[PDB]
Design an enzyme around this catalytic site. Structure first.
Site, PDB file in Angstrom:
ATOM      1  N   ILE A  25      -8.539   8.474   6.188  1.00 25.72           N
ATOM      2  CA  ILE A  25      -9.813   7.945   5.906  1.00 25.72           C
ATOM      3  C   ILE A  25      -9.684   6.286   5.581  1.00 25.72           C
ATOM      4  CG2 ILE A  25     -11.767   8.165   4.509  1.00 25.72           C
ATOM      5  CD1 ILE A  25     -10.819  11.120   3.848  1.00 25.72           C
ATOM      6  N   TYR A  26     -10.653   5.587   6.341  1.00 22.85           N
ATOM      7  CA  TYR A  26     -10.832   4.238   6.060  1.00 22.85           C
ATOM      8  C   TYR A  26     -12.024   4.067   5.171  1.00 22.85           C
ATOM      9  CZ  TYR A  26      -6.616   3.193   9.232  1.00 22.85           C
ATOM     10  OH  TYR A  26      -5.332   3.191   9.556  1.00 22.85           O
ATOM     11  N   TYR A  27     -11.977   2.983   4.310  1.00 22.92           N
ATOM     12  CA  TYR A  27     -12.821   2.595   3.478  1.00 22.92           C
ATOM     13  C   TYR A  27     -13.448   0.988   3.607  1.00 22.92           C
ATOM     14  CZ  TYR A  27     -11.745   6.993   1.089  1.00 22.92           C
ATOM     15  OH  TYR A  27     -11.516   8.020   0.705  1.00 22.92           O
TER      16      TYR A  27
END
Ligand SMILES: [K+]
Ligand SMILES: [K+]
Lengths: 177, 177
Positions: free
Chosen positions: B38-40
């Site tokens: 998951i990227y933020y």
């Protein structure tokens, strides 16, 4: 997420060592924790204005990152709390700082934990602040906690002053006096 | 902090399975990793504009929070990288979101890792993007890596196209075509 509900007491009488003597025979010792906490701020959201907290705790070598939301009560210290264990304190601090968080203040204490029927009683000796007791409830109500704290202080003849300020806020109040 | 230096190749020929057959006898299999990332983003710093990244990776059940700084090279994929293992993915994601980070995009792959004399060769099968190979250097130079990648592709007769775009950037390019 979980809801932390606890009551913090500034001890006036007696000494914590005297209080441990008084509870030793009916309360079961859990452990002693040497806790060094780094708190963080974010320049966008003032965690002082929004009443939030971010902590990197080292407790007996275990490293714990904790978010704390705003207080939900005025009678006890009640806040949303989300925590994870992380593998490396220095690297977690580095990540937070690379992301733009700034180190705010550091709290250090020795904490002695005891257990008496779904209640955790923590005798806290806070560097520069003095002697406190926290009582946290497992599966408890604000009313059940307020009643136990009241039976606790009276059964062990403790002179106290309740507060819902955090140790971080208390330290800042202390630094400028 | 450490400096990650790696080269990513879009495989055109042959198939990764054919490539594994070709390397199987001289490269030592390490492990296979199923990685869900998951990227933020942060609304203050556009990690697209500052060329930074924040990732919560689940690799074979192990949970890893990684910061990646801006690229330092134009010939290889070279970035500062700081990583910690965390105890709980859901809670770490919750903390990031409570702090104001927003979930950006998700990358998922199967990765097969091999080892040949201080070089890690990772055969990557990327959901929706296709077959890639990464080569990372342990205690290596940009020149030493560029020379090994060149000996690697030629010894195993691989048709490739090098890139220093990340899988995140590549996925976004792919979504709008
Ligand atoms: K606490
Ligand atoms: K990578």
């Amino acid at each position: 997420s979980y809801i932390e509900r606890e009551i913090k007491l500034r001890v006036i009488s007696p000494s914590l060592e005297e209080i441990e003597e008084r509870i030793r025979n009916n309360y079961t010792f859990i452990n002693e924790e040497h806790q060094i906490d780094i708190y963080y701020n974010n320049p966008i959201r003032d965690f002082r204005k929004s009443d939030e907290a971010l902590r990197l705790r080292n407790t007996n070598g275990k490293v714990i990152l904790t978010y704390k939301g705003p207080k939900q009560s005025k009678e006890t210290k009640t806040r949303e709390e989300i925590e994870v264990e992380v593998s490396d304190l220095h690297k977690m601090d580095l990540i937070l700082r690379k992301l733009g968080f700034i180190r705010s203040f550091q709290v250090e204490k020795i904490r002695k934990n005891y257990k008496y029927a779904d209640f955790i009683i923590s005798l806290d000796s806070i560097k520069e602040l003095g002697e406190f007791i926290e009582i946290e409830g497992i599966n408890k109500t604000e009313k059940e906690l307020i009643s136990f704290v009241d039976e606790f202080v009276k059964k062990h003849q403790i002179q106290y002053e309740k507060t819902i300020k955090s140790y971080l806020e208390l330290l800042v109040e202390h630094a400028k006096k």
